[PDB]
Ligand binder design. Structure first.
Ligand SMILES: O=C(O)CCC(=O)C(=O)O
Ligand SMILES: O=C(O)CCC(=O)C(=O)O
Ligand SMILES: O=C(O)CCC(=O)C(=O)O
Ligand SMILES: [Mg+2]
Ligand SMILES: [Mg+2]
Lengths: 447, 447, 447
């Protein structure tokens, strides 16, 4: 957190490299290594670079600035210092997540991290609240197909919570948990998931900024540790058809004045009015939130309408068929689980749109619908239409049009992020709709 | 720096070999190893060879002397002593960069290192200045193509500043930085570059001679360490079509009387008249400087007119589309970035022509044009012609003809370097224009 | 020549398909097959399509019309009727070369065949002349490389005029000559040429239109018969480095009032003033004619300045070192051989520019230089500069700039052909200068 606490770690623990990490518009991490020199001269050089930051070409980063105005800076947040465990111990490598700033020393408008800081500071100023998030990012461990090395397949034919040798990843998950604990994570649980080769490593909830910094670090840690064990980890929302997809369920709650505002001992389901207003806001902008929280073309193969998925815009208690599920835990742990996201989204922008839509419901005091305790997959389309259970868009372009017409998310993301995201994703969608797919070749080459 | 300091290190550190290194006309390093014998007899033998120098066949070195007058000598610069880290630690190998001298003990006219010393001593005598340079030499890490071992491809599908495992070179860059630090380099930053398998390792600026000595050692260090990790590093300006090329942006500035002459607190853009006169001189001889700073046929595939490259002869503040870019840093760090060079050039001759053209503008007090803050790539050829933004030559022969007619660079390089360079490069160009290329076979074999 | 003569041959010889052939701007032949029906109804259908022609999409043809004005027509030239021998004999396939016409029934401006007809009709109207041409189009017979099937090599290690089995093409040349004789050719001689696998099949001279129609049919006849004998023929100007290239020497002469105007019994070298004026005109526009007669990038690897080639702009008697050679035959056979062309050029445009530059000399009565009887390759560059022997451009772009500034060839080709040719060839040149060649990879990957 303090300059001296970082410099004295570097002196005693023999740190040789400092990675200045950040994220592009799509949530891909980017960094530059700075070599620390020995003695006081090296520590005073590092002090200048930690306080004043360093320059970088912004035109090469996705969704940042043009070539004619490329000069940018990185101001390190010292409260995010950590030692990368996958790197060597002697002459160790360390990281410090930064905020992208303009040449004039002003926070960059198109920065995803600064976008989340802005909305959290605005929430803390207006309501004196703290936005807490706890995600469940699932992933797949892959190995080369023996019949064809150009394709990849799942690492094992394991099921949900299966034991070894059926589950061939206890050693891979073991090292992942050790690596995350060294990075400052409070790991809660680890196990095999429903689909073959699928796994899930959960971690404790925290404020949206610390949680988004943890999601970026979690994705790199899982990919780099898998390569050490000769495997390849992917956070693709649906790498294989006919089996479960990778989902990042976001358990969330807001605490006004250091108290659990979502809990109300004397109320229906022990849920406060603030909780219901927040849920109403998420359900209102649900068709627009999935553009950010599900930004890939493949996301709409897991989150597919008309088929078993968290596509139905409705809330329910202890029911995994609806888009929102209220876990049975009460008191401090009273929360809502937004099941629509997948680990392909930028966490900084995902928590921004969720907090903005949720706070829109709290500010206007919007009325939430009744909980659909029944299984929604077993219901017919005519029955769901009578109840008013709408579905999330069927494809990426359908979600981008909903995001474009939404003014609540446009203001939260800002003109720079909102317009660049739509422009990048429309070019990505155009590339998909023009390409001749393998499905088409299989179905129409015979005609 | 002195004879005794070198012999004191050689004695204690068990140095067993001394490489007498130098460079040919094209900037290719050349050296001869000397074994240091044990005891006082070995130290006194090494002493005699360090002061009086040693002989070598000059006819075999490129652009040096004929067979009928081949006897030459190497006078070591004792301050350039360094232990090669890629060589063993026990019975360590050391190097000493030398100045090529004639049999009569007079500095050789056709020596690139002596050419840079001459112009720097002339500048220090006339203006009491110090010419500082800080380059950014980019390179590619390659691996054999699995589909064909005779061809090479990039080591990874990484982008700008990408993180591991997408960036497969943190271990290669780690050892590069450690090796350069042992050689006396002040490494500033290291990261992955825009094109696949492309990387960039930056180092602190220094006087042109110490910087040119560092560029030669840097190129060898990067190539030798890559071979240790089973890869092959290349400083080719454009090894692959459709992706960024290797560029060596030269950040430079002159300090008259130990003061930053380029900075002026009370002036437009906080840039002095001396800075504008220097920029005017570079832009004047821009068509001739690219012959030396871009001496390969392949250089004009990266630095290609009509396409996105630093080809437009103009200057601008924080704009990477023009040939010169003035970084936003001010005070001591006030400088100009000549973006046209690539790491294929001889650094000793590149800094000589840049200082000569720049000083031609300072001596005559030439008027620089207005800065083109707009993106020059988006401009049309008719618009660029109205403004007067000329382009650098389209090929090697076009640049050699410009260098031949330029009298400012002819005098700085000297009759020996100027004529031998043109003769060697014209034979190189003739070999290219007569050879039947793979592009021609693909396009015209069908006709 | 008339509709009835063509329908009478079709009736008796059992012709089942009628190809309507023509050429694009680059000289590539293009055609559409029309199946002839049996009985009177089929002959009356064929009569209608022969008299009125047929429609086709002009936007798909190179250098013709845009997509918004694509409707075009083909008016058959009945004199160019011929039977394709390589096609089956029973239910034979006949061809008829056509003139491209606009929807309004007016000759198309951008038609290469109509361009040659226009200048020949203008010459016959103004001077009452007949432009005769007799080319020598050389070609290479290739076979797959046994060490690598992806590459091609020459069919045999034969030399000039060599005998079998050293010359492995007597059977291939035999069938070529039989096929050309059936198409109406007057074949003069056939033999093996200097380079390995290179051959030459000569044919009698005729008026420029009949000769250009023969060059197109010859190129197709050579390639189709080569594929029948398991080989691949190429008219590439220089498929391999270090061996002779394919050249199309154009023997030409003009006959005013049915008399050999180039011959003069009482004159120096027995050559008339009209011959000298014509030669002066070719030498004047020589730098611009090579843009059309040598339109490929590869053409400047055969026609390479500074090396043994017909690059020297000068004329001489029985000397193959100069651009023009006057063969020793006199009387009717008095002619000039323009040695610069290669079989990669469009014959219709090549004969147009040669006749236009030649007639420019006749109209203005330009003075020709003295004949250089000495070998020009043995001369030094300083000696050739004193005599005034200039050289043809070193590359495609250098020739396109000369063609652009030439007003004589601009008028002969017309605004449509002149501008489209320059536009197509500049895009072709830009593709070459941007591509990374195999020569560059071999020479610079090591640096
Ligand atoms: O497998 C896991 O989920 C954690 C590691 C573990 O339990 C083990 O090492 O056996
Ligand atoms: O990756 C770099 O640029 C330097 C090396 C490094 O940071 C590492 O060893 O992880
Ligand atoms: O080979 C030739 O040049 C023509 C054909 C021939 O003479 C032959 O059939 O042997
Ligand atoms: Mg010796
Ligand atoms: Mg830096």
């Amino acid at each position: 957190s303090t300059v001296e606490q970082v410099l004295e770690y570097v002196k005693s623990n023999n740190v040789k490299f400092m990675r200045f990490q950040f994220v592009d518009i799509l949530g891909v991490p980017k960094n530059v290594a700075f070599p620390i020199k020995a003695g006081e001269k090296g520590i005073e050089e590092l002090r200048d670079v930690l306080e004043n930051g360093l320059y970088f070409d912004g035109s090469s980063i996705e969704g940042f600035v043009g070539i004619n105005e490329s000069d940018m800076m990185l101001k390190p947040d010292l409260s995010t210092f950590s030692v990368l465990p996958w790197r060597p111990s002697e002459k160790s490598v360390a990281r410090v997540i930064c905020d992208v700033y303009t040449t004039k020393g002003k926070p960059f408008e198109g920065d995803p991290r600064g976008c989340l800081k802005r909305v959290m500071e605005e929430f803390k100023k207006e309501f004196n609240g703290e936005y807490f998030v706890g995600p469940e990012p699932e992933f797949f461990l892959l190995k080369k197909d023996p019949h064809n090395p150009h394709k990849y397949i799942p690492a094992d034919d394991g099921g949900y919570f299966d034991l070894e040798p059926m589950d061939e990843a206890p050693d891979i998950r073991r090292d992942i948990v050790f690596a995350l604990e060294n990075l400052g994570f409070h790991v809660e649980a680890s196990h095999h998931e429903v689909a073959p080769g699928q796994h899930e490593v959960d971690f404790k909830f925290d404020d949206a900024l610390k949680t988004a910094d943890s999601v970026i670090t979690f994705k790199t840690t899982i990919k780099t540790i898998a390569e050490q064990h000769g495997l390849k980890a992917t956070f693709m929302p649906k790498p294989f058809f006919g089996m479960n997809g990778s989902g990042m369920h976001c358990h969330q709650s807001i605490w006004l004045n250091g108290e659990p505002s979502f809990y109300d001992e004397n109320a229906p389901y022990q849920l406060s009015e603030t909780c219901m207003n927040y849920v109403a806001g998420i359900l209102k902008h649900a068709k627009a939130i999935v553009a950010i929280t599900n930004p890939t073309v493949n996301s709409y193969k897991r989150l597919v309408p008309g088929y078993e998925a968290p596509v139905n815009i409705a809330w329910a208690n202890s029911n995994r068929s609806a888009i929102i599920r209220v876990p049975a835990a009460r008191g401090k742990g009273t929360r809502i689980e937004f099941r629509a996201p997948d680990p392909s989204c930028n966490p900084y922008l995902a928590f921004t749109v969720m907090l903005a839509a949720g706070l829109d419901g709290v500010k206007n005091k919007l009325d939430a619908p009744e909980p659909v305790e029944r299984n929604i997959f077993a219901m017919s389309e005519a029955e769901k239409k009578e109840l008013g259970i709408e579905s999330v868009p069927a494809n990426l372009k359908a979600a981008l049009d909903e995001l474009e017409n939404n003014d609540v998310l446009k203001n939260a993301l800002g003109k720079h992020i909102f317009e660049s995201f739509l422009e990048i994703k429309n070019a990505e969608w155009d590339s998909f709709r023009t390409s001749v797919t393998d499905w088409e070749t299989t179905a129409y080459l015979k005609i």
